[PDB]
């Protein structure tokens, strides 16, 4: 028998791992990436409305 002349074959492509579609970084707000070019904290502030008086 051919103990020496029958090859073994390798595929030239690796199987890439199956992994979840990422979505959340496209859904949330990115606006503070403009300010966050430096430093390790961003402070965001909000209005408290003035009261209506009689």
């Amino acid at each position: 028998a051919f103990n020496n002349f029958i090859p073994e074959l390798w595929s030239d492509m690796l199987l890439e791992e199956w992994t979840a579609q990422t979505v959340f970084a496209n859904l949330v707000n990115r606006e503070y990436e403009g300010i966050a070019s430096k430093g390790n904290v961003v402070h965001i502030a909000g209005v408290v409305a003035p009261t209506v008086k009689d």
Binding site: V47, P50, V52, K53
Partner: protein
């Protein structure tokens, strides 16, 4: 007209009425301190829009 014999006499007309009283008078009144206007990170004109939204 038949119960009245066949008599008719003229009634006086009259009206009803209601008053729309224009009795609500409401205000906004607030300070924007110059030291605060200078020391804060950006425009305080959002407080004028908040006052308008409150009325």
């Amino acid at each position: 007209y038949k119960a009245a014999g066949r008599q008719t006499s003229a009634d006086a007309i009259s009206d009803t009425g209601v008053d729309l009283l224009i009795d609500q008078e409401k205000s906004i009144d607030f300070l924007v301190d110059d030291i605060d206007r200078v020391q804060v990170a950006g425009s305080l004109e959002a407080y004028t829009r908040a006052g308008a939204t409150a009325l």
